[PDB]
Structure formats: C-alpha cells, structure tokens
Amino acid sequence: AKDPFAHLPKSTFALDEFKRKYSNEDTLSVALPYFWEHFDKDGWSLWYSEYRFPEELTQTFMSCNLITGMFQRLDKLRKNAFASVILFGTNNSSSISGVWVFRGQELAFPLSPDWQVDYESYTWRKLDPGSEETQTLVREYFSWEGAFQHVGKAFNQGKIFK
To answer: Could you list the residue range(s) of the whole structural domain that residue 53 is in?
Structure first.
C-alpha cells in the first residue's frame, strides 16, 4: 500500500536521467531528441493543463508558491512523474499552464486519493507523442524559447516538478 507505479515492470525510459540534461544541456537538441526517439508511449504519458480556474489567480509572487504547495503534496509522486509548470500573465490576469508526465495510463492523481485535493480546478488530458501540437507545446514548455502564443499571456515565471 505505497507507490502506484509499483505494479508496472522495469521502467524503460529514465526520468531521473532526463531531468539532468533537461536544464544542464541545450535541451532543444539534447533532451528533446533524446525524448522523441524512444520515449515510452506504452507507459509514460503527457498531460497538458491550463489551470481551468485562472480566476483564482490575482498576483505574481503567490502563484509560484501555490504551484509548489501542490508539489509538496505530490512529493511521493515526483519519484515517478515530472512537470514544467509556468506562471504567466501578471497580477491583473494571470494563468498557470504546463505539461506533466505520469508513468501509467492515468495521471497518477486518480491512482491515489493522497493527491485529489484541489487538482479538480485544473484540466488534465493525455495527448499523442507524435501529434503536431503536443510536440510544439512540449518544445515550448521544455525549452521556454517556444513562443507561448497558444497562451498569449507572457512566460514570466517557470517552475519545475523535479
């Protein structure tokens, strides 16, 4: 009665390795190609979110703290999941968006009511690792260089769920 991704076999792809080159290297041609060659689309999955209640946001300094407060509940989760959550906009109209990774068919939150607090106010959808959009969104959320025009806010403050 611990670790939801313990029913699964050997983990092919190595999240904790990827997390180094992700920021240690030129991800655009380092982590990106090393992620898009042989991901693990049988087991890992990508989950886009855009904080479905961005009305709840009304500063900048606080939202970075808020995102992270979630991550401190999800502290027994990061051991088999990651995300690149970004705070956008400003006080006047902020938003949180980002893409998360969880190691099963589900987003991990439903795999344990340990992690079913305020998550409902955020969207969570699986997407295809050979779409067009997912590949762009990932590149933007992972490089921070992308364009973020799909948000149309501004990038202000990134956060990582490592």
So the answer is: 1-162
